[PDB]
Amino acid sequence: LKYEEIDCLINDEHTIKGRREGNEVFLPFTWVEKYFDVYGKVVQYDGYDRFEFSHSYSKVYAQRAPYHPDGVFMSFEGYNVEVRDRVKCISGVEGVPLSTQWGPQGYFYPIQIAQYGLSHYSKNLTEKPPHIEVYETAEDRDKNKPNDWTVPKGCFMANVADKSRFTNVKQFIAPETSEGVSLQLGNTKDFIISFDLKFLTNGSVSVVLETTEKNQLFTIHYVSNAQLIAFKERDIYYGIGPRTSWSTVTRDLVTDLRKGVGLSNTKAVKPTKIMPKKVVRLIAKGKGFLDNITISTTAHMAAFFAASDWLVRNQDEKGGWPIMVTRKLGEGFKSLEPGWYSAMAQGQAISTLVRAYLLTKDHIFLNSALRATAPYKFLSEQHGVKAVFMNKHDWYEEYPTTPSSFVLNGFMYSLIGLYDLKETAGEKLGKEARSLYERGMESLKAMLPLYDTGSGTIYDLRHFMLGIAPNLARWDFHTTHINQLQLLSTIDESPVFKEFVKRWKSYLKGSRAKHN
Amino acid sequence: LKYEEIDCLINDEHTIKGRREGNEVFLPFTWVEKYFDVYGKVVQYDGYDRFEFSHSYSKVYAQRAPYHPDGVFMSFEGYNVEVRDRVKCISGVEGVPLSTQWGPQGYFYPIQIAQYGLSHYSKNLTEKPPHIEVYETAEDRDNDWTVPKGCFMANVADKSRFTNVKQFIAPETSEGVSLQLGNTKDFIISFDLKFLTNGSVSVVLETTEKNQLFTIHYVSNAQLIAFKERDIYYGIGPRTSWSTVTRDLVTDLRKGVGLSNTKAVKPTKIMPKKVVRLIAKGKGFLDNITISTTAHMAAFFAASDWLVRNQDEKGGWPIMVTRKLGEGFKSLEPGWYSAMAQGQAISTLVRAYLLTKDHIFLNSALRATAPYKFLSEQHGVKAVFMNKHDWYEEYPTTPSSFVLNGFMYSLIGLYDLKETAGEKLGKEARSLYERGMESLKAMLPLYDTGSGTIYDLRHFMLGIAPNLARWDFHTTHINQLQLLSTIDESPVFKEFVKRWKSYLKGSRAKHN
Ligand SMILES: O=C(O)[C@H]1O[C@@H](O[C@H]2[C@H](O)[C@@H](NS(=O)(=O)O)[C@@H](O[C@H]3[C@H](O)[C@@H](O)[C@H](O[C@H]4[C@H](O)[C@@H](NS(=O)(=O)O)[C@@H](O[C@H]5[C@H](O)[C@@H](O)[C@H](O[C@H]6[C@H](O)[C@@H](NS(=O)(=O)O)[C@@H](O[C@H]7[C@H](O)[C@@H](O)[C@H](O)O[C@@H]7C(=O)O)O[C@@H]6CO)O[C@@H]5C(=O)O)O[C@@H]4CO)O[C@@H]3C(=O)O)O[C@@H]2CO)[C@H](O)[C@@H](O)[C@@H]1O
Ligand SMILES: O=C(O)[C@H]1O[C@@H](O[C@H]2[C@H](O)[C@@H](NS(=O)(=O)O)[C@@H](O[C@H]3[C@H](O)[C@@H](O)[C@H](O[C@H]4[C@H](O)[C@@H](NS(=O)(=O)O)[C@@H](O[C@H]5[C@H](O)[C@@H](O)[C@H](O[C@H]6[C@H](O)[C@@H](NS(=O)(=O)O)[C@@H](O[C@H]7[C@H](O)[C@@H](O)[C@H](O)O[C@@H]7C(=O)O)O[C@@H]6CO)O[C@@H]5C(=O)O)O[C@@H]4CO)O[C@@H]3C(=O)O)O[C@@H]2CO)[C@H](O)[C@@H](O)[C@@H]1O
Ligand SMILES: *[C@@H]1O[C@H](CO)[C@@H](O[C@@H]2O[C@H](CO)[C@@H](O[C@@H]3O[C@H](CO[C@H]4O[C@H](CO)[C@@H](O)[C@H](O)[C@@H]4O)[C@@H](O)[C@H](O[C@H]4O[C@H](CO)[C@@H](O)[C@H](O)[C@@H]4O[C@@H]4O[C@H](CO)[C@@H](O)[C@H](O)[C@H]4NC(C)=O)[C@@H]3O)[C@H](O)[C@H]2NC(C)=O)[C@H](O)[C@H]1NC(C)=O
Ligand SMILES: *[C@@H]1O[C@H](CO)[C@@H](O[C@@H]2O[C@H](CO)[C@@H](O[C@@H]3O[C@H](CO[C@H]4O[C@H](CO)[C@@H](O)[C@H](O)[C@@H]4O[C@@H]4O[C@H](CO)[C@@H](O)[C@H](O)[C@H]4NC(C)=O)[C@@H](O)[C@H](O)[C@@H]3O)[C@H](O)[C@H]2NC(C)=O)[C@H](O)[C@H]1NC(C)=O
Ligand SMILES: *[C@@H]1O[C@H](CO)[C@@H](O[C@@H]2O[C@H](CO)[C@@H](O[C@@H]3O[C@H](CO[C@H]4O[C@H](CO)[C@@H](O)[C@H](O)[C@@H]4O)[C@@H](O)[C@H](O[C@H]4O[C@H](CO)[C@@H](O)[C@H](O)[C@@H]4O)[C@@H]3O)[C@H](O)[C@H]2NC(C)=O)[C@H](O)[C@H]1NC(C)=O
Ligand SMILES: *[C@@H]1O[C@H](CO)[C@@H](O[C@@H]2O[C@H](CO)[C@@H](O[C@@H]3O[C@H](CO[C@H]4O[C@H](CO)[C@@H](O)[C@H](O)[C@@H]4O)[C@@H](O)[C@H](O[C@H]4O[C@H](CO)[C@@H](O)[C@H](O)[C@@H]4O)[C@@H]3O)[C@H](O)[C@H]2NC(C)=O)[C@H](O)[C@H]1NC(C)=O
Ligand SMILES: *[C@@H]1O[C@H](CO)[C@@H](O[C@@H]2O[C@H](CO)[C@@H](O)[C@H](O)[C@H]2NC(C)=O)[C@H](O)[C@H]1NC(C)=O
Ligand SMILES: *[C@@H]1O[C@H](CO)[C@@H](O)[C@H](O)[C@H]1NC(C)=O
Ligand SMILES: [Ca+2]
Ligand SMILES: [Ca+2]
């Protein structure tokens, strides 16, 4: 019985080269992979090779506990927003990501900002507490080389009381055409730098980094202007704004280095493998005050509050976060001009704001969340987010298009937001959220089957709205769909959610609905 | 060819044995076939072996002409209704198939009867004319008759039929009178018959089952079918007035030998290889004894006549069996109507009218639109999708089911009628067709999975998994849309035909 080449005719159209042993035919995975759109590779173990086949990529989140508004946000403990190449950088002034997804010019995308917040919130609950190293308090610390300041000629420093802040602070005076005053740091493990800052004049706070790229030094300059980001090797510049009143500056030096070096005029940051291996020293220029200089493994809550604060300050009078970029969802849909709202933005923002409220009891956050339900009440053409499927089912549009698009995953995020709010706001204040949630959940249960292909899910209902082919959801949207339904199945006991979760999971392993 | 056997882990769940050459891994088709639900086999040609892979089974009809109401019915020239194992037999009395699909007791299913008619109509237009061999006219045509003692035969005039006929008298406790036939090529027997008493006309067949003789008895009672040893019995009814009896001896033999108490006929390989002789018992008359390759028009008119005689006062063909479409749908009690039955019946009746100009057929067709006007709950066939789109239900369930293929057959019927009845008489059909076609265009995308079609909308109506259409229903869907695309110029039909065809070859809608 010979093992030999055999011609394999595919659908009477093309011949590939297979192999035959007796009656058994073997087909090349090169063909299988492309023809069925599946995944595989040879994995090398110690003394053992194994081919490993997968129907899909992407994994379902292993939910540990029922969903609650003050817990982790779905699967976002595993999200890494800032490494996404559509994140140009973390704004120095705002402390939140700028997106370039639909425009190289860059814009604050509320969805991305909410996800930044919610992922950092979730990581705060799941990760080990950070190591925190304190380099300067200007107190009676009063050892451990906290006074390793270099003060060149023409510069001055002092420990001085700040009555307003009930603490001692480090005063510094250093002209910009000088070396500046310099604090030796030397951290090789942790790369989140933090310091309380108040400038009297223009100036900068700079951090020198040893990197993994051939031992070479890069400096990151945090400058008292509004310029976003600049890179002229080996110097990276972020404007952090005037900082003429006390604030805590928190920066991730890994992200700030990678986004600097990777700076691009395109919609995508250049890939780089560069990492900082040592935080060498901090340089202060101009006239001002410093306190509480620290380096931490992580600073999740600072990120979360930067997102929350941004959402409060940037909400408009209609309760919305307008998206200031043109969105063309596809042929047959009208272009959305800048200033459109997204049900996904509203929902993700509400989930952020509700968590901010529950932590602080600061009603400013809750009130912003309550205002954010207003766009759910108005049709897309009335500058809202509401669509109605076949004059029967209310829907909250990720993309408020004409005709309506009915994107599934944005809708479910819009509902989770409403849930967080209605559970938190109390009976009287939460009435509108409760009503929108109940109507929305009724729609979801009725319409879920329209998104099921029998071997996957559809992203939206454009096939029906425009009379074209289904827009099939790629596997990472399919797992998003599962993660969302899995979450909803813990706050609503409807059997339909559990049955759909189970079937949609089976699709990841190549199961199919039965044919007749 | 050198290789290495290599373990192939499938979805982290089970391991199969593959083969590796360099970076290339080859997977066993044994696995591919089952895992992806695909088809393949090694075909041996002279000096060339080739593995031949198919994503699907089932082929799209190669349309040769735009659709017309008096032409072939879609792809039905290729249909073979009578070999289907859910056809218990061709009724002796009625000359149409009896179904056992949803009950072993058997029932006349109007859809199956219409398809019998429409397939034979279509074959009539596409096949070569049959060879017809005439054995007895009782004229001055040319005896091959054996008349045992105690039997009698004569040539006698029949004034009513303007012909001479063969009189026969033969007691049942005798061999009967026998005409030698001897046909080895053709197996459709035909004869004009009139009994004076009870009796039988029997046909002896030489068969492929160890050269054995089997006899098929056409008996003057209403008993459906019986099989004992090498004798098969069909009741053909009293036959006390002249009628033409036409029987397919291949089918009649296979259904006899395959006789079962289940919903499916037993498979058999048995075939007749010779029509030996015809035996007459009792008192009666015979004329025009013939054997033909085919008799398509006799089959077509048996179906048409049955439809005329069995239509009720509401214009419907009631289906006299319980239908349970699935969990979530109320059972349909016997007497329900089907939009597919109404449509297929209309398509049959319209063709019968255009051949004969007999207005009885057109009148029956016109009456058959009435159930399309009434909701399922009012004992009609109409459903309304989301208070917007009229639909004609193959299965008029509660809740509504929206079976695609039945709906399209219901529309083709309305089309046949509106085109044939003229402007005034065809008004109701035209209105129902136009509304229906609007619905079809709007709702087609709901049946598209991106790699196939769904059979119905039960997933949405009941909140469950999609009921995916088998490949043979998917090709039915394509054949129907292809037909509609030749009588309606809407781009949507051409676009859907094209995409749905691509699915047969493993193409998929793009993911985002
Ligand atoms: O350690 C490791 O192994 C590595 O980890 C890597 O990160 C992992 C991470 O650990 C994983 N987390 S875990 O699974 O939980 O453990 C995992 O996280 C992913 C996750 O799988 C994704 O589901 C998730 O998606 C997010 C989006 O990131 C987010 N975007 S953002 O704006 O906030 O930045 C948001 O997406 C919605 C937004 O509205 C839009 O961005 C998005 O646009 C769609 C568009 O709607 C589509 N339109 S279409 O009409 O259907 O076509 C479509 O459009 C594009 C077409 O696809 C193209 O053909 C066309 O040319 O261009 C079109 C276009 O861009 O316009 O697609 C786009 C883009 O998706 O719509 C979104 C919507 O909701 O509809 O919210 C999503 C859902 O939550 O991102 C997670 C994440 O990155 O955190 O996987 C990642 C890896 O991928 C590390 O990166 C690595 O360093 C480690 O080594
Ligand atoms: O050439 C040779 O060598 C061989 O040829 C062989 O025949 C070929 C033939 O040449 C082909 N023709 S060609 O393509 O033109 O070249 C081809 O003909 C087929 C064709 O592919 C089919 O599309 C066609 O389907 C017909 C039906 O036969 C017909 N039925 S009948 O009543 O008239 O007898 C009619 O079907 C509708 C009826 O209302 C019902 O019968 C039917 O019931 C469905 C039911 O609705 C489904 N329900 S579900 O809730 O969705 O599941 C489903 O139900 C069954 C489930 O599948 C099972 O799981 C369960 O256990 O049992 C369920 C049940 O039975 O209840 O399926 C059933 C059955 O389909 O609904 C129909 C509807 O319209 O919805 O109309 C159909 C479409 O026109 O049949 C053609 C034919 O046979 O003529 O293919 C054959 C290959 O077989 C010879 O056979 C061979 O001898 C030669 O050697
Ligand atoms: C599809 O369906 C069509 C339509 O049915 C079919 O065409 C018909 O084919 C049949 C074949 O049997 C033809 O029937 C014959 O009709 C003869 C008289 O018909 C006249 O009128 C029609 C129009 O109405 C004219 O077009 C036609 O040209 C004629 O002028 C009739 O004489 C025949 O009767 C003889 O044969 C039968 C058995 O078939 C027998 O029982 C009779 O006793 C009679 O005896 C024999 O006569 C023939 C002479 O025809 C003679 O050769 C023979 O020797 C005699 N036998 C003996 C022993 O002496 C018969 O009824 C019909 O005309 C066709 N119609 C049309 C419109 O073409 C197609 O063939 C079908 N195709 C397929 C693929 O299924
Ligand atoms: C998820 O988020 C929660 C809530 O935010 C975190 O828990 C909180 O952790 C923080 C610790 O960062 C804790 O904060 C208090 O901070 C006070 C600040 O005072 C001192 O620490 C800072 C540096 O962190 C310095 O800048 C100050 O100058 C103070 O320095 C002290 O004095 C000497 C110098 O002379 C210094 O060497 C000492 O190390 C330092 N002393 C101490 C005790 O740090 C503290 O006064 C106070 O004790 C807290 O540390 C806050 O209380 C936590 N809240 C809760 C509810 O637990 C989680 O860590 C976070 N988890 C994850 C995984 O992200
Ligand atoms: C560097 O990091 C340290 C943290 O380690 C910061 O020092 C803390 O600063 C905060 C405020 O800036 C101080 O908290 C304030 O306490 C005031 C009263 O403090 C007295 O009483 C306490 C004991 O109860 C004594 O320990 C203390 O010495 C004082 O005698 C309050 O009046 C302040 O709150 C007021 O306003 C809020 C509303 O916003 C109300 O909630 C209050 O009721 C009140 O009206 C405030 O809470 C804290 O004492 C400092 N800690 C230490 C250990 O010194 C530095 O500020 C930081 N550096 C910079 C520049 O920010
Ligand atoms: C075996 O097969 C043969 C066919 O080969 C059948 O014989 C035919 O039978 C039919 C019907 O019985 C005969 O058709 C009838 O012919 C009548 C007159 O025939 C001739 O005679 C007149 C003159 O007297 C001529 O003018 C005429 O042109 C004919 O040449 C017609 O009067 C009949 O008319 C029909 O229509 C009118 C209404 O429009 C009715 O009133 C009548 O009742 C009838 O329906 C009719 O056309 C045909 O002539 C026979 N052909 C031959 C060659 O004999 C046998 O009947 C069949 N055997 C059996 C048992 O059925
Ligand atoms: C930092 O420098 C800018 C100039 O680049 C200063 O901005 C000016 O401020 C004065 C008020 O004192 C205004 O009248 C000018 O119009 C501003 N000019 C520009 C170009 O913005 C800024 O004041 C400096 N910062 C501090 C703390 O003094
Ligand atoms: C007619 O039926 C009777 C019994 O009902 C039977 O005795 C007789 O054999 C039958 N006659 C013929 C000719 O078959
Ligand atoms: Ca201090
Ligand atoms: Ca005669």
Side-chain angles (χ1 to χ4, degrees), chain B residues 150-180:
Chain B
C151 300
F152 172 82
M153 296 195 72
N155 287 339
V156 308
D158 199 286
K159 306 218 300 186
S160 77
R161 276 310 217 120
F162 299 95
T163 204
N164 289 339
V165 298
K166 210 72 185 189
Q167 177 182 41
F168 66 87
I169 305 168
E172 190 280 338
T173 64
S174 77
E175 291 175 15
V177 298
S178 185
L179 173 60
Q180 209 69 12

Short mmCIF file of all heavy atoms in Angstrom, two decimals, chain B residues 150-180:
data_model
loop_
_atom_site.label_atom_id
_atom_site.label_comp_id
_atom_site.label_asym_id
_atom_site.label_seq_id
_atom_site.Cartn_x
_atom_site.Cartn_y
_atom_site.Cartn_z
N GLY B 150 -64.66 -23.58 -21.59
CA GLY B 150 -65.48 -22.90 -20.60
C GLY B 150 -65.29 -21.39 -20.61
O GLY B 150 -65.89 -20.71 -19.81
N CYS B 151 -64.47 -20.88 -21.54
CA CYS B 151 -64.33 -19.44 -21.80
C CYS B 151 -64.78 -19.15 -23.24
O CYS B 151 -64.88 -20.05 -24.05
CB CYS B 151 -62.89 -18.96 -21.64
SG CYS B 151 -62.21 -19.23 -19.98
N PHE B 152 -65.03 -17.87 -23.54
CA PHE B 152 -65.47 -17.43 -24.86
C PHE B 152 -64.90 -16.04 -25.16
O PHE B 152 -64.68 -15.24 -24.24
CB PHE B 152 -66.99 -17.43 -24.93
CG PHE B 152 -67.57 -16.83 -26.19
CD1 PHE B 152 -67.65 -17.58 -27.36
CD2 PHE B 152 -68.03 -15.52 -26.21
CE1 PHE B 152 -68.17 -17.03 -28.52
CE2 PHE B 152 -68.56 -14.97 -27.37
CZ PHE B 152 -68.63 -15.73 -28.52
N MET B 153 -64.68 -15.77 -26.45
CA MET B 153 -64.28 -14.45 -26.93
C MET B 153 -64.96 -14.19 -28.28
O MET B 153 -65.32 -15.11 -28.96
CB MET B 153 -62.76 -14.35 -27.13
CG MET B 153 -61.97 -14.50 -25.84
SD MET B 153 -60.25 -13.97 -26.00
CE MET B 153 -60.44 -12.19 -26.12
N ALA B 154 -65.10 -12.91 -28.63
CA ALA B 154 -65.68 -12.50 -29.90
C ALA B 154 -65.28 -11.06 -30.20
O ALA B 154 -65.01 -10.28 -29.28
CB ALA B 154 -67.19 -12.63 -29.85
N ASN B 155 -65.22 -10.71 -31.49
CA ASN B 155 -65.17 -9.33 -31.94
C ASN B 155 -66.60 -8.83 -32.10
O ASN B 155 -67.37 -9.43 -32.82
CB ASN B 155 -64.39 -9.17 -33.25
CG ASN B 155 -62.90 -9.34 -33.06
OD1 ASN B 155 -62.39 -9.18 -31.96
ND2 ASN B 155 -62.19 -9.66 -34.13
N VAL B 156 -66.95 -7.74 -31.40
CA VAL B 156 -68.31 -7.20 -31.42
C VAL B 156 -68.23 -5.67 -31.53
O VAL B 156 -67.28 -5.06 -31.05
CB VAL B 156 -69.11 -7.66 -30.18
CG1 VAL B 156 -69.07 -9.17 -30.01
CG2 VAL B 156 -68.66 -6.97 -28.91
N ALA B 157 -69.23 -5.06 -32.17
CA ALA B 157 -69.29 -3.62 -32.35
C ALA B 157 -69.77 -2.96 -31.05
O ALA B 157 -70.56 -3.54 -30.31
CB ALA B 157 -70.18 -3.27 -33.51
N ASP B 158 -69.25 -1.76 -30.78
CA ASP B 158 -69.73 -0.88 -29.73
C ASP B 158 -70.12 0.44 -30.39
O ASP B 158 -69.26 1.26 -30.73
CB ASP B 158 -68.68 -0.68 -28.63
CG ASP B 158 -69.24 -0.17 -27.31
OD1 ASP B 158 -69.60 1.02 -27.24
OD2 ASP B 158 -69.33 -0.98 -26.37
N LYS B 159 -71.43 0.64 -30.58
CA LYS B 159 -71.96 1.79 -31.30
C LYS B 159 -71.52 3.08 -30.58
O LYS B 159 -71.09 4.03 -31.23
CB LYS B 159 -73.48 1.69 -31.44
CG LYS B 159 -74.01 0.40 -32.05
CD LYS B 159 -75.21 0.55 -32.98
CE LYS B 159 -76.44 1.16 -32.33
NZ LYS B 159 -77.61 1.15 -33.24
N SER B 160 -71.60 3.07 -29.24
CA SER B 160 -71.30 4.26 -28.45
C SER B 160 -69.86 4.74 -28.71
O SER B 160 -69.62 5.96 -28.78
CB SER B 160 -71.56 4.01 -26.97
OG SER B 160 -70.51 3.25 -26.37
N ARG B 161 -68.92 3.80 -28.87
CA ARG B 161 -67.50 4.13 -28.98
C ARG B 161 -67.00 4.09 -30.44
O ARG B 161 -65.82 4.36 -30.68
CB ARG B 161 -66.69 3.21 -28.07
CG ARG B 161 -66.60 3.67 -26.62
CD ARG B 161 -66.18 5.12 -26.53
NE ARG B 161 -65.30 5.42 -25.42
CZ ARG B 161 -64.06 5.91 -25.55
NH1 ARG B 161 -63.60 6.23 -26.74
NH2 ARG B 161 -63.30 6.05 -24.48
N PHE B 162 -67.90 3.79 -31.39
CA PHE B 162 -67.63 3.82 -32.85
C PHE B 162 -66.42 2.93 -33.20
O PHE B 162 -65.54 3.32 -33.98
CB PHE B 162 -67.40 5.25 -33.34
CG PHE B 162 -68.56 6.19 -33.15
CD1 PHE B 162 -68.64 7.01 -32.02
CD2 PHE B 162 -69.57 6.28 -34.10
CE1 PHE B 162 -69.70 7.88 -31.85
CE2 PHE B 162 -70.63 7.15 -33.92
CZ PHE B 162 -70.70 7.95 -32.80
N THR B 163 -66.40 1.73 -32.63
CA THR B 163 -65.27 0.83 -32.77
C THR B 163 -65.75 -0.60 -32.52
O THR B 163 -66.81 -0.82 -31.94
CB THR B 163 -64.14 1.23 -31.81
OG1 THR B 163 -62.90 0.75 -32.32
CG2 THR B 163 -64.34 0.72 -30.39
N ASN B 164 -64.93 -1.56 -32.95
CA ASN B 164 -65.08 -2.94 -32.54
C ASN B 164 -64.24 -3.17 -31.28
O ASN B 164 -63.19 -2.56 -31.10
CB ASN B 164 -64.68 -3.91 -33.65
CG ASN B 164 -65.66 -3.94 -34.80
OD1 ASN B 164 -66.82 -3.57 -34.65
ND2 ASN B 164 -65.22 -4.42 -35.94
N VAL B 165 -64.74 -4.06 -30.43
CA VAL B 165 -64.14 -4.38 -29.16
C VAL B 165 -64.05 -5.90 -29.03
O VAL B 165 -64.70 -6.65 -29.78
CB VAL B 165 -64.91 -3.75 -27.99
CG1 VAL B 165 -64.91 -2.23 -28.08
CG2 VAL B 165 -66.34 -4.27 -27.84
N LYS B 166 -63.24 -6.34 -28.07
CA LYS B 166 -63.05 -7.72 -27.76
C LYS B 166 -63.92 -8.08 -26.56
O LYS B 166 -63.66 -7.61 -25.45
CB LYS B 166 -61.56 -7.97 -27.48
CG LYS B 166 -61.05 -9.34 -27.83
CD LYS B 166 -60.95 -9.53 -29.32
CE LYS B 166 -60.56 -10.93 -29.71
NZ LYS B 166 -60.26 -11.01 -31.15
N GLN B 167 -64.95 -8.89 -26.78
CA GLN B 167 -65.76 -9.43 -25.70
C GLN B 167 -65.03 -10.64 -25.11
O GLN B 167 -64.42 -11.41 -25.84
CB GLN B 167 -67.14 -9.84 -26.21
CG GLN B 167 -68.04 -10.48 -25.15
CD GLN B 167 -69.37 -10.90 -25.74
OE1 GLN B 167 -69.43 -11.43 -26.84
NE2 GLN B 167 -70.45 -10.66 -25.00
N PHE B 168 -65.11 -10.81 -23.79
CA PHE B 168 -64.52 -11.96 -23.12
C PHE B 168 -65.47 -12.44 -22.02
O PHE B 168 -66.12 -11.65 -21.37
CB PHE B 168 -63.13 -11.63 -22.56
CG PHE B 168 -63.08 -10.62 -21.44
CD1 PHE B 168 -63.25 -11.02 -20.12
CD2 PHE B 168 -62.83 -9.28 -21.70
CE1 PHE B 168 -63.18 -10.09 -19.09
CE2 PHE B 168 -62.76 -8.35 -20.67
CZ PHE B 168 -62.94 -8.76 -19.36
N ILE B 169 -65.53 -13.76 -21.86
CA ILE B 169 -66.26 -14.41 -20.78
C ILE B 169 -65.36 -15.52 -20.23
O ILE B 169 -64.99 -16.43 -20.96
CB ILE B 169 -67.63 -14.96 -21.25
CG1 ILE B 169 -68.49 -13.88 -21.91
CG2 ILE B 169 -68.35 -15.64 -20.09
CD1 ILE B 169 -69.70 -14.41 -22.65
N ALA B 170 -65.02 -15.43 -18.94
CA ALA B 170 -64.12 -16.37 -18.31
C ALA B 170 -64.40 -16.45 -16.81
O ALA B 170 -64.21 -15.47 -16.09
CB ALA B 170 -62.69 -15.96 -18.56
N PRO B 171 -64.84 -17.62 -16.29
CA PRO B 171 -65.05 -17.76 -14.85
C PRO B 171 -63.72 -17.61 -14.10
O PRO B 171 -62.65 -17.85 -14.67
CB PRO B 171 -65.67 -19.16 -14.70
CG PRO B 171 -65.26 -19.91 -15.95
CD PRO B 171 -65.12 -18.85 -17.04
N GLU B 172 -63.81 -17.21 -12.83
CA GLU B 172 -62.65 -16.92 -11.99
C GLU B 172 -61.91 -18.22 -11.64
O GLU B 172 -60.69 -18.22 -11.54
CB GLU B 172 -63.09 -16.18 -10.72
CG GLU B 172 -61.94 -15.62 -9.90
CD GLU B 172 -61.22 -16.61 -9.00
OE1 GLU B 172 -61.82 -17.66 -8.65
OE2 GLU B 172 -60.05 -16.34 -8.65
N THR B 173 -62.66 -19.32 -11.49
CA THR B 173 -62.09 -20.62 -11.20
C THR B 173 -61.55 -21.26 -12.49
O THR B 173 -61.68 -22.46 -12.69
CB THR B 173 -63.14 -21.52 -10.53
OG1 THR B 173 -64.20 -21.75 -11.47
CG2 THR B 173 -63.71 -20.93 -9.26
N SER B 174 -60.95 -20.45 -13.37
CA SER B 174 -60.37 -20.91 -14.63
C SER B 174 -59.09 -20.11 -14.91
O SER B 174 -58.81 -19.14 -14.21
CB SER B 174 -61.36 -20.79 -15.75
OG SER B 174 -61.48 -19.45 -16.19
N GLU B 175 -58.32 -20.53 -15.92
CA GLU B 175 -57.06 -19.88 -16.28
C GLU B 175 -57.32 -18.44 -16.75
O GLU B 175 -56.45 -17.60 -16.63
CB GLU B 175 -56.36 -20.61 -17.42
CG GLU B 175 -55.80 -21.97 -17.05
CD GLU B 175 -55.22 -22.72 -18.24
OE1 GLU B 175 -54.99 -22.08 -19.29
OE2 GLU B 175 -55.00 -23.94 -18.13
N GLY B 176 -58.50 -18.20 -17.32
CA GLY B 176 -58.83 -16.95 -17.99
C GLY B 176 -58.37 -16.97 -19.44
O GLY B 176 -57.66 -17.88 -19.87
N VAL B 177 -58.81 -15.96 -20.20
CA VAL B 177 -58.35 -15.77 -21.57
C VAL B 177 -57.06 -14.94 -21.54
O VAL B 177 -56.92 -14.03 -20.73
CB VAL B 177 -59.43 -15.12 -22.47
CG1 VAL B 177 -60.66 -16.01 -22.58
CG2 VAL B 177 -59.81 -13.72 -22.02
N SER B 178 -56.13 -15.27 -22.44
CA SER B 178 -54.76 -14.82 -22.33
C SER B 178 -54.26 -14.36 -23.70
O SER B 178 -54.41 -15.06 -24.69
CB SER B 178 -53.91 -15.94 -21.77
OG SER B 178 -52.59 -15.49 -21.54
N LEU B 179 -53.68 -13.16 -23.74
CA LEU B 179 -53.08 -12.59 -24.93
C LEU B 179 -51.56 -12.55 -24.74
O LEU B 179 -51.08 -11.90 -23.81
CB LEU B 179 -53.64 -11.18 -25.16
CG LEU B 179 -52.99 -10.36 -26.28
CD1 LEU B 179 -53.13 -11.06 -27.62
CD2 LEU B 179 -53.59 -8.97 -26.34
N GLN B 180 -50.82 -13.22 -25.63
CA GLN B 180 -49.36 -13.19 -25.62
C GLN B 180 -48.90 -11.80 -26.06
O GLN B 180 -49.46 -11.23 -27.00
CB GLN B 180 -48.78 -14.30 -26.50
CG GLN B 180 -47.41 -14.80 -26.04
CD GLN B 180 -47.45 -15.57 -24.73
OE1 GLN B 180 -48.52 -15.95 -24.24
NE2 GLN B 180 -46.28 -15.82 -24.15
#
